[PDB]
């Protein structure tokens, strides 16, 4: 199958700036190439195709160029209907292939998480579980690291994590970590902390307390 | 407007076999798109329905089979023996016309494939303390476990308070089931005085629950 590169896989750009992202074709594909524009929650919409032609009511701020192996899409001006993810897709040779997508994120300065922690309820603890959750509120970039220690023991396995979409207000991610142990493991430690490393931070963070306490 | 309309939500357990459909209203080929939970874009093959001529993504070939029913517009996606890693949003796409290739999509099937079970969520505090408050800000939130399918929907006071809340996607657990969080940031002198209140709806399992969260 034709092997199609999109870089960057994410950018971060401000309302009015003019933003290029590139598609790469491991072989010839002459201009048979389509741009999609991709939201949350919403199916792909094509918004270029023959790598230049734009679609019918697609704002002419798009335009595609490129023929061959290497293709661009233009934003000349940045709008914030624009933040999206970006797909091409060669149409030359069945299977028509996909590149992995490119993120267009809104910029905005380094900030900080404020980082909270949550012992279990005593709701669940009666159920027979422990989860301990820590909050990393309004920050950025979205990168950031969590570790957990119990009684000062790197925990592996068992905690998963996810992230808010940027907020488009603030332009910030919040990032939810949870640590589930059953009751029994739970109660056979005292200390849980949460450890977080964010380009915000000069140093890591730790939030934690004491089963009982 | 030239439509495809592709047929609703599956819930299905591993080695079931299950038919989409995508009907066309207002193509001479309609392709089929995969796009797992998170992941991106992967074309999975076409059907040229005048005479039912397939061809499929070598990826694909023998794992699903694509079909046609020109007499009524309708192209369709079908798996013998479901996995869990059929578990994705399908798209159908097609062409209103000779000259613009994939300018027509369906709105997408969402398909998830477990061994688990409908089941409702528990809803925990996550309760306002000194370890979650920040120089005059606290948070606080509802912890929304163990449930399956997708989805769950949160609200705050029955949609009163939105500002400064956060709904997390959920994770899918090693249990099959999911979890997610609602968090909210709040002025710790309201802590006491404003009653907060986490609305869960799980319309799969008919549960609601109302949680009061407190200090
Ligand atoms: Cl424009
Ligand atoms: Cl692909
Ligand atoms: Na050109």
Known sequence: ???????????????????????????????????????????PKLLIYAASALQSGVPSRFSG????????????????????????????????????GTKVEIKRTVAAPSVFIFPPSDEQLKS????????????????????WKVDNALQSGNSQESVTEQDSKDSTYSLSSTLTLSKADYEKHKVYACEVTHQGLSSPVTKSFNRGE | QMQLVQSGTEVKKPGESLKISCKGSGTYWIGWVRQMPGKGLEWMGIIYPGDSE???????????????????????????????????????AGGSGISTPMDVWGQGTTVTVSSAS????????????????????AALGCLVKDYFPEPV??????????????????????????????????????????????????????????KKVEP
Not at chain 1, 22 to 40: G, V
Not at chain 1, 128 to 147: H, I
Not at chain 2, 189 to 210: A, E
């Open chain 2, 153 to 210: 929907t949160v609200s705050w006071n029955s949609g009163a308070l939105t500002s400064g809340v956060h709904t997390f996607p959920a994770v899918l657990q090693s249990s099959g089931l999911y979890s997610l969080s609602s968090v909210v940031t709040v002025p710790s002198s309201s802590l006491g005085t404003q009653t907060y209140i986490c609305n869960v709806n799980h319309k799969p399992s008919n549960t609601k629950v109302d």
């Open chain 1, 1 to 43: 199958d034709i092997q199609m590169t999109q870089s960057p896989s994410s950018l971060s750009a401000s309302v009015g700036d003019r933003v290029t992202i590139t598609c790469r074709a491991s072989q010839s594909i002459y201009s048979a190439l389509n741009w999609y524009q991709q939201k949350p929650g919403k199916a």
């Open chain 1, 128 to 147: 027979g579980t422990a989860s301990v959750v820590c909050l990393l509120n309004n920050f950025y970039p979205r990168e950031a690291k969590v570790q």
């Open chain 2, 118 to 137: 409908t089941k409702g969520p528990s809803v925990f505090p996550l309760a306002p303390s000194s370890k979650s408050t920040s120089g005059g800000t």
């Open chain 1, 65 to 100: 160029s490129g023929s061959g192996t290497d293709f661009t899409l233009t934003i000349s001006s940045l709008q914030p209907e624009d933040f999206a993810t970006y797909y091409c897709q060669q149409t030359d040779i069945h299977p028509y292939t996909f590149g992995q």
């Open chain 2, 54 to 92: 397939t061809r499929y993504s070598p990826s694909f070939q023998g794992q699903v089979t694509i079909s046609a029913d020109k007499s009524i517009n309708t192209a369709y996606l079908q798996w013998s023996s479901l996995k869990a890693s059929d578990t994705a949003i399908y798209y159908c």
